Design an enzyme around this catalytic site. Structure first.
Site, PDB file in Angstrom:
ATOM      1  N   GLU A  41       1.062  -1.045  -0.205  1.00  0.00           N
ATOM      2  CA  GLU A  41       0.075  -0.079  -0.308  1.00  0.00           C
ATOM      3  C   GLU A  41       0.957   1.031   0.105  1.00  0.00           C
ATOM      4  O   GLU A  41       0.375   2.201  -0.576  1.00  0.00           O
ATOM      5  CB  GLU A  41      -0.816  -0.093   1.201  1.00  0.00           C
ATOM      6  CG  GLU A  41      -1.950  -0.601   0.385  1.00  0.00           C
ATOM      7  CD  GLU A  41      -2.957  -0.153  -0.427  1.00  0.00           C
ATOM      8  OE1 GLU A  41      -2.369   0.388  -1.145  1.00  0.00           O
ATOM      9  OE2 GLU A  41      -4.381  -0.362  -0.632  1.00  0.00           O
ATOM     10  N   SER A  42       2.115   1.108   0.544  1.00  0.00           N
ATOM     11  CA  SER A  42       2.587   2.111   0.752  1.00  0.00           C
ATOM     12  C   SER A  42       4.169   2.250   0.948  1.00  0.00           C
ATOM     13  O   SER A  42       5.466   3.235   1.450  1.00  0.00           O
ATOM     14  CB  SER A  42       2.329   3.716   2.605  1.00  0.00           C
ATOM     15  OG  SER A  42       2.570   2.667   3.420  1.00  0.00           O
TER      16      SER A  42
END
Ligand code: LEU
Ligand code: CL
Length: 424
Positions: free
Chosen positions: A284-285
């Site tokens: 996701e990040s």
């Protein structure tokens, strides 16, 4: 009693191997390993239960084959012997790896054999690698290298990573496996061609089991099995890209310690492997609490404002609170899947609704059903997802177009980082 009869009558295939996630590894979600998964399918082929042992170094791995009542075979990323020893035989090769000289990025770059002169070099005592060095030591009498009975391949690469040694020699498959932990490690040049891995059996003229090992390996090549195990265990660089592999290694060491604790506390009650949770984090990040995009998601687990609202997240940019909302949200989705979908397939369908949503995932499930496939099986519905981006196919769904290919990438990658963290 033949070697083959004996196993069939004992109900058990005794196999010896190294301790390493390349070969065999024990975790929460069970045992894994290229060699393990392969030797497991061989014990399955014969009707027998597999039993794994481990040697402490490779001289002792080979020794056990000579022991009375010891292991039927060694399945251990061994590559055959260049010379003559009556105490060991080798199957057909089942995988093309290239030995490669390994160096620390930005240090002096060896490009030919000469350059290995006057370097601190470590290698496993009893390895083919050790033996390729002795041969060059004939050509180059000034060559020094250390042969160690105590360390494994993972240790040799660590050493080059942080500079306690300059160089090592290792097979390219395990290099790539290991590139996701050692961000500075690099391939100096290829010290040979793609010689193959083979299983080792004690010396002799009995072939009952050897022919079967060879029949099994030729079948395995026929069905893509080795290619699939290769991608899971040894395709990190191939799949994630070189840059993806080493940066991941950077982030494991520089970013994950800051959040691991929170990943673990969320795991505890939700009965959800924290490492699965961190893998979502990473996809996701890349473990960046402060990350935002241009599409409605902020934070470590990339949450929408409406999800953060529903999960009771005050600050989408706080690492703990992002993880908690994002972990709670994966489990809410996992829990909303139809009762018909079973673990472990359940968790993989949950990863996919996490990227694409329940509505769209339902359509690919429905699509698998119309095509005669099982909509409760992940490998089945993953073949449909991409189709949600195809005219002839989306125009037949209730919810139309969706980036299904992105969604397949999303679950494969999370599943691969999940493996990686399991293999630390
Ligand atoms: C470095 C070793 C563990 C592996 C190598 N292919 C060998 O057979 O010796
Ligand atoms: Cl998958």
């Amino acid at each position: 009693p033949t070697a083959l009869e004996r196993v069939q009558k004992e109900g058990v295939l005794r196999v010896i191997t190294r301790n390493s996630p390349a070969t065999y590894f024990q975790d929460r979600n069970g045992e894994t390993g290229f060699e393990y998964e392969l030797a497991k399918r061989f014990a399955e082929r014969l009707g027998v239960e597999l039993k794994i042992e481990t040697a402490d170094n490779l001289d002792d791995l080979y020794a056990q084959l000579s022991r009375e009542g010891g292991p039927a075979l060694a399945a251990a990323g061994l590559t055959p012997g260049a010379a003559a020893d009556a105490s060991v035989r080798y199957s057909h090769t089942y995988l093309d790896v290239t030995p490669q000289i390994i160096y620390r990025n930005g240090q002096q770059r060896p490009t030919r054999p000469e350059d290995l002169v006057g370097k601190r070099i470590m290698v496993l005592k009893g390895s083919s690698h050790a033996e390729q060095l002795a041969e060059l030591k004939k050509q180059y009498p000034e060559l020094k290298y250390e042969e160690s009975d105590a360390v494994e391949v993972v240790d040799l690469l660590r050493m080059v990573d942080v500079g306690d040694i300059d160089l090592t020699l290792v097979d390219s498959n395990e290099l790539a496996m290991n590139q996701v932990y050692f961000p500075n490690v690099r391939v100096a040049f290829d010290f040979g061609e793609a010689r193959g891995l083979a299983w080792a059996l004690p010396g002799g003229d009995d072939d009952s089991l050897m022919n079967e090992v060879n029949a099994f390996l030729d079948q395995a090549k026929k069905e893509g099995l080795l290619q699939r195990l290769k991608d899971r265990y040894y395709g990190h660089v191939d799949v994630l890209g070189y840059v993806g592999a080493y940066t991941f290694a950077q982030h494991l060491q520089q970013r994950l310690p800051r959040y691991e604790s929170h990943f673990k506390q969320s795991g505890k009650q939700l009965d959800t492997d924290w490492r699965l949770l961190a893998a979502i984090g990473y996809q996701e990040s890349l473990w960046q609490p402060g990350a935002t995009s241009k599409t409605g998601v902020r934070g470590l687990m990339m949450l929408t404002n409406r999800t953060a609202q529903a999960m009771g997240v005050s600050n989408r940019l706080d690492p703990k609170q992002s993880i908690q909302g994002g972990s709670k949200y994966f489990v809410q989705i996992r829990s909303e899947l139809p009762e018909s979908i079973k673990e472990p397939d359940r968790s993989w369908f949950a990863l996919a609704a996490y990227n694409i949503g329940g509505a769209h995932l339902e359509d690919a499930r429905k699509m698998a059903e119309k095509e005669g496939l099982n909509p409760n099986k992940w490998l089945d519905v993953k073949k449909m997802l991409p189709r949600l981006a195809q005219k002839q196919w989306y125009a037949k769904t209730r919810y139309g177009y969706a980036r299904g290919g992105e969604t397949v990438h999303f679950v494969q990658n999370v599943r691969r980082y999940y493996d990686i963290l399991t293999w630390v």
